[PDB]
mmCIF file of C-alpha atoms in Angstrom:
data_model
loop_
_atom_site.group_PDB
_atom_site.id
_atom_site.type_symbol
_atom_site.label_atom_id
_atom_site.label_comp_id
_atom_site.label_asym_id
_atom_site.label_seq_id
_atom_site.Cartn_x
_atom_site.Cartn_y
_atom_site.Cartn_z
ATOM 1 C CA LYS A 1 94.166 124.412 84.880
ATOM 2 C CA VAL A 2 97.666 123.327 86.197
ATOM 3 C CA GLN A 3 97.814 120.416 88.633
ATOM 4 C CA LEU A 4 101.463 119.490 89.624
ATOM 5 C CA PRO A 5 103.369 117.300 88.719
ATOM 6 C CA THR A 6 102.222 117.371 85.009
ATOM 7 C CA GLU A 7 103.121 114.264 82.985
ATOM 8 C CA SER A 8 104.749 116.196 80.038
ATOM 9 C CA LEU A 9 106.645 119.475 79.774
ATOM 10 C CA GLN A 10 104.728 119.946 76.577
ATOM 11 C CA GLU A 11 101.204 120.003 78.287
ATOM 12 C CA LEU A 12 102.383 122.560 80.808
ATOM 13 C CA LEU A 13 103.868 124.716 78.076
ATOM 14 C CA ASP A 14 100.634 124.497 75.939
ATOM 15 C CA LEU A 15 98.595 125.598 79.049
ATOM 16 C CA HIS A 16 100.957 128.464 79.613
ATOM 17 C CA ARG A 17 100.839 129.595 75.879
ATOM 18 C CA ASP A 18 97.051 129.569 75.845
ATOM 19 C CA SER A 19 96.816 131.448 79.167
ATOM 20 C CA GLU A 20 99.549 133.871 77.946
ATOM 21 C CA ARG A 21 97.561 134.658 74.746
ATOM 22 C CA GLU A 22 94.467 135.370 76.755
ATOM 23 C CA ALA A 23 96.446 137.628 79.152
ATOM 24 C CA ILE A 24 97.882 139.567 76.113
ATOM 25 C CA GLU A 25 94.254 139.914 74.692
ATOM 26 C CA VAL A 26 93.162 141.265 78.129
ATOM 27 C CA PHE A 27 96.086 143.731 78.014
ATOM 28 C CA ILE A 28 95.415 144.866 74.394
ATOM 29 C CA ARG A 29 91.704 145.574 75.260
ATOM 30 C CA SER A 30 92.692 147.777 78.293
ATOM 31 C CA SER A 31 95.814 149.563 76.926
ATOM 32 C CA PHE A 32 96.390 152.526 74.721
ATOM 33 C CA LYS A 33 99.417 154.643 73.679
ATOM 34 C CA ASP A 34 102.116 152.326 75.090
ATOM 35 C CA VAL A 35 105.104 154.285 74.178
ATOM 36 C CA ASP A 36 108.002 152.086 72.863
ATOM 37 C CA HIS A 37 105.803 149.119 73.880
ATOM 38 C CA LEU A 38 107.220 149.452 77.429
ATOM 39 C CA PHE A 39 104.216 148.068 79.364
ATOM 40 C CA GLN A 40 103.869 145.265 76.835
ATOM 41 C CA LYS A 41 107.559 144.290 77.326
ATOM 42 C CA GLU A 42 106.862 144.516 81.158
ATOM 43 C CA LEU A 43 104.022 142.094 80.742
ATOM 44 C CA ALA A 44 106.189 139.780 78.524
ATOM 45 C CA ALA A 45 108.878 139.726 81.046
ATOM 46 C CA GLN A 46 106.393 138.945 83.927
ATOM 47 C CA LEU A 47 104.893 136.191 81.908
ATOM 48 C CA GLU A 48 108.302 134.659 81.102
ATOM 49 C CA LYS A 49 109.283 134.780 84.829
ATOM 50 C CA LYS A 50 106.012 132.902 85.575
ATOM 51 C CA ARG A 51 106.738 130.358 82.850
ATOM 52 C CA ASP A 52 110.108 129.661 84.501
ATOM 53 C CA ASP A 53 108.606 129.511 87.999
ATOM 54 C CA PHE A 54 105.881 127.011 87.020
ATOM 55 C CA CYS A 55 108.309 124.802 85.014
ATOM 56 C CA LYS A 56 110.704 124.794 88.020
ATOM 57 C CA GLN A 57 107.856 124.017 90.571
ATOM 58 C CA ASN A 58 106.774 121.176 88.092
ATOM 59 C CA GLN A 59 110.444 119.726 88.185
ATOM 60 C CA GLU A 60 110.499 119.940 91.934
ATOM 61 C CA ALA A 61 107.038 118.315 92.466
ATOM 62 C CA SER A 62 107.892 115.525 89.949
ATOM 63 C CA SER A 63 111.142 114.879 91.760
ATOM 64 C CA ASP A 64 109.752 114.832 95.223
ATOM 65 C CA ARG A 65 106.789 112.515 94.184
ATOM 66 C CA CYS A 66 109.195 110.216 92.308
ATOM 67 C CA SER A 67 111.625 110.153 95.271
ATOM 68 C CA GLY A 68 108.734 109.306 97.665
ATOM 69 C CA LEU A 69 107.467 106.649 95.347
ATOM 70 C CA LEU A 70 110.794 104.878 94.948
ATOM 71 C CA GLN A 71 111.059 104.956 98.781
ATOM 72 C CA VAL A 72 107.602 103.302 98.977
ATOM 73 C CA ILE A 73 108.310 100.694 96.216
ATOM 74 C CA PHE A 74 111.896 99.823 97.060
ATOM 75 C CA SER A 75 111.742 100.180 100.892
ATOM 76 C CA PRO A 76 110.884 96.430 101.302
ATOM 77 C CA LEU A 77 113.828 95.467 99.105
ATOM 78 C CA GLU A 78 116.219 97.736 101.189
ATOM 79 C CA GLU A 79 115.017 96.136 104.401
ATOM 80 C CA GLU A 80 115.207 92.646 102.754
ATOM 81 C CA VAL A 81 118.921 93.433 102.008
ATOM 82 C CA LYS A 82 119.503 94.591 105.583
ATOM 83 C CA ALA A 83 118.121 91.405 106.945
ATOM 84 C CA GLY A 84 120.484 89.396 104.799
ATOM 85 C CA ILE A 85 117.898 87.654 102.650
ATOM 86 C CA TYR A 86 120.073 87.791 99.567
ATOM 87 C CA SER A 87 123.298 86.746 101.509
ATOM 88 C CA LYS A 88 123.228 83.241 100.087
ATOM 89 C CA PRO A 89 124.405 81.324 96.873
ATOM 90 C CA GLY A 90 122.409 82.652 93.957
ATOM 91 C CA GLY A 91 121.215 85.606 96.149
ATOM 92 C CA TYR A 92 122.513 88.156 93.642
ATOM 93 C CA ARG A 93 120.303 86.727 90.991
ATOM 94 C CA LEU A 94 117.280 86.926 93.238
ATOM 95 C CA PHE A 95 118.117 90.520 94.231
ATOM 96 C CA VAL A 96 118.441 91.521 90.401
ATOM 97 C CA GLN A 97 115.091 89.823 89.533
ATOM 98 C CA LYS A 98 113.318 91.562 92.442
ATOM 99 C CA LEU A 99 114.868 94.888 91.474
ATOM 100 C CA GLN A 100 113.649 94.501 87.786
ATOM 101 C CA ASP A 101 110.039 93.481 89.204
ATOM 102 C CA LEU A 102 110.027 96.757 91.359
ATOM 103 C CA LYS A 103 111.254 98.925 88.504
ATOM 104 C CA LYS A 104 108.277 97.441 86.420
ATOM 105 C CA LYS A 105 106.033 98.356 89.339
ATOM 106 C CA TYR A 106 107.503 101.964 89.352
ATOM 107 C CA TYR A 107 106.773 102.405 85.622
ATOM 108 C CA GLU A 108 103.124 101.403 86.156
ATOM 109 C CA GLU A 109 102.406 104.048 88.754
ATOM 110 C CA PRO A 110 100.783 107.237 87.184
ATOM 111 C CA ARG A 111 101.530 111.017 87.785
ATOM 112 C CA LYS A 112 105.185 110.730 88.027
ATOM 113 C CA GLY A 113 105.778 113.700 85.788
ATOM 114 C CA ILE A 114 108.980 114.727 83.813
ATOM 115 C CA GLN A 115 111.659 113.550 86.472
ATOM 116 C CA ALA A 116 110.455 109.944 86.458
ATOM 117 C CA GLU A 117 113.439 108.492 84.555
ATOM 118 C CA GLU A 118 116.100 110.750 86.046
ATOM 119 C CA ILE A 119 115.029 110.139 89.529
ATOM 120 C CA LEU A 120 114.914 106.305 89.046
ATOM 121 C CA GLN A 121 118.403 106.308 87.305
ATOM 122 C CA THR A 122 119.865 108.429 90.196
ATOM 123 C CA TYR A 123 118.350 105.902 92.631
ATOM 124 C CA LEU A 124 119.525 102.703 90.803
ATOM 125 C CA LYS A 125 123.093 104.221 90.607
ATOM 126 C CA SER A 126 122.991 104.812 94.374
ATOM 127 C CA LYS A 127 122.386 101.037 94.864
ATOM 128 C CA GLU A 128 125.199 99.707 92.665
ATOM 129 C CA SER A 129 127.480 99.427 95.660
ATOM 130 C CA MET A 130 124.775 97.369 97.439
ATOM 131 C CA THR A 131 124.429 95.071 94.317
ATOM 132 C CA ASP A 132 128.279 94.577 94.163
ATOM 133 C CA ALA A 133 128.402 93.775 97.824
ATOM 134 C CA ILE A 134 125.696 91.114 97.468
ATOM 135 C CA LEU A 135 127.547 89.782 94.435
ATOM 136 C CA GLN A 136 130.804 89.478 96.418
ATOM 137 C CA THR A 137 128.999 87.718 99.263
ATOM 138 C CA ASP A 138 127.236 85.308 96.941
ATOM 139 C CA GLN A 139 130.485 84.441 95.141
ATOM 140 C CA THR A 140 132.308 84.000 98.475
ATOM 141 C CA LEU A 141 129.573 81.719 99.816
ATOM 142 C CA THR A 142 129.241 79.768 96.526
ATOM 143 C CA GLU A 143 133.043 79.104 96.579
ATOM 144 C CA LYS A 144 132.826 78.032 100.239
ATOM 145 C CA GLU A 145 130.040 75.609 99.330
ATOM 146 C CA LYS A 146 132.026 74.254 96.524
ATOM 147 C CA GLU A 147 135.061 73.759 98.742
ATOM 148 C CA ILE A 148 132.799 72.083 101.347
ATOM 149 C CA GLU A 149 131.406 69.725 98.637
ATOM 150 C CA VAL A 150 134.981 69.030 97.334
ATOM 151 C CA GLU A 151 136.279 68.321 100.815
ATOM 152 C CA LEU B 1 136.692 111.176 105.297
ATOM 153 C CA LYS B 2 133.848 112.664 107.355
ATOM 154 C CA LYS B 3 136.483 114.331 109.474
ATOM 155 C CA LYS B 4 138.089 115.637 106.206
ATOM 156 C CA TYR B 5 134.700 116.963 105.020
ATOM 157 C CA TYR B 6 134.232 118.858 108.289
ATOM 158 C CA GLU B 7 137.590 120.528 107.814
ATOM 159 C CA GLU B 8 136.672 121.974 104.408
ATOM 160 C CA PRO B 9 135.540 125.694 104.511
ATOM 161 C CA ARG B 10 132.625 127.398 102.823
ATOM 162 C CA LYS B 11 130.208 124.595 103.009
ATOM 163 C CA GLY B 12 127.358 126.795 104.149
ATOM 164 C CA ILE B 13 124.065 126.041 106.017
ATOM 165 C CA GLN B 14 123.281 122.664 104.154
ATOM 166 C CA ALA B 15 126.614 121.060 105.345
ATOM 167 C CA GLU B 16 125.103 118.574 107.812
ATOM 168 C CA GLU B 17 121.832 117.874 105.896
ATOM 169 C CA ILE B 18 123.669 116.964 102.669
ATOM 170 C CA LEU B 19 126.287 114.914 104.562
ATOM 171 C CA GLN B 20 123.549 112.937 106.453
ATOM 172 C CA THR B 21 121.600 112.392 103.173
ATOM 173 C CA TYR B 22 124.815 111.085 101.596
ATOM 174 C CA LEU B 23 125.699 108.858 104.583
ATOM 175 C CA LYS B 24 122.168 107.347 104.614
ATOM 176 C CA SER B 25 122.463 106.597 100.812
ATOM 177 C CA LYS B 26 125.504 104.385 101.588
ATOM 178 C CA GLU B 27 124.076 102.396 104.456
ATOM 179 C CA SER B 28 123.167 99.600 101.959
ATOM 180 C CA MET B 29 126.757 99.496 100.760
ATOM 181 C CA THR B 30 127.927 99.322 104.458
ATOM 182 C CA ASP B 31 125.577 96.461 105.021
ATOM 183 C CA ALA B 32 126.623 94.478 101.861
ATOM 184 C CA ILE B 33 130.342 94.884 102.977
ATOM 185 C CA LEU B 34 129.288 93.626 106.424
ATOM 186 C CA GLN B 35 127.507 90.451 104.991
ATOM 187 C CA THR B 36 130.501 89.826 102.723
ATOM 188 C CA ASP B 37 132.971 90.189 105.664
ATOM 189 C CA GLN B 38 130.858 87.921 107.918
ATOM 190 C CA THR B 39 130.534 85.248 105.177
ATOM 191 C CA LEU B 40 134.219 85.258 104.405
ATOM 192 C CA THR B 41 135.262 85.297 108.084
ATOM 193 C CA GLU B 42 132.882 82.186 108.633
ATOM 194 C CA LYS B 43 134.402 80.512 105.599
ATOM 195 C CA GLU B 44 137.998 81.184 106.916
ATOM 196 C CA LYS B 45 136.876 79.754 110.321
ATOM 197 C CA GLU B 46 135.426 76.634 108.735
ATOM 198 C CA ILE B 47 138.723 76.250 106.676
ATOM 199 C CA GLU B 48 140.826 76.494 109.856
ATOM 200 C CA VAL B 49 138.546 74.052 111.770
ATOM 201 C CA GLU B 50 138.616 71.590 108.829
#
């Protein structure tokens, strides 16, 4: 029943709780005279350990899928920056518009899972320095054009 | 700063991989600084020529 990444943590937890209850019913039907409920505690500990593993694997699968998807979506933009496409007057504004359009595209893609926002924010924060460098280049070029026109 | 990072002990087995991943994340910043430098250097050259 579990296909990773799951869209919500809640769906994964509900699937775990249902499967956990059925596993407890299987144990109750095949157990007797469990002194101090030792075997039942062992089963509960094993089920908790599996809940933690599957939640961690879901976080990893979601992170990896979102990281690959951001590389796919924003790889053209990164190459366009390297080629100097935004190194012109008003080029920062074009970069910001294109960045917003690509964020909108990333939101539309399905099966991102629980790390969708966190991975995107981590990615956007990693590109702030690139944004600022484009802004400084735009301002410097715009000032140079203004001086050329004044002269 | 890379030389400083290499000098620090107790980095463990992911030392190179984490550094390469970090340096690759800053390529865009490097390129933006380069474009800004070139644009400013050209503007200074035009100002001197004028």
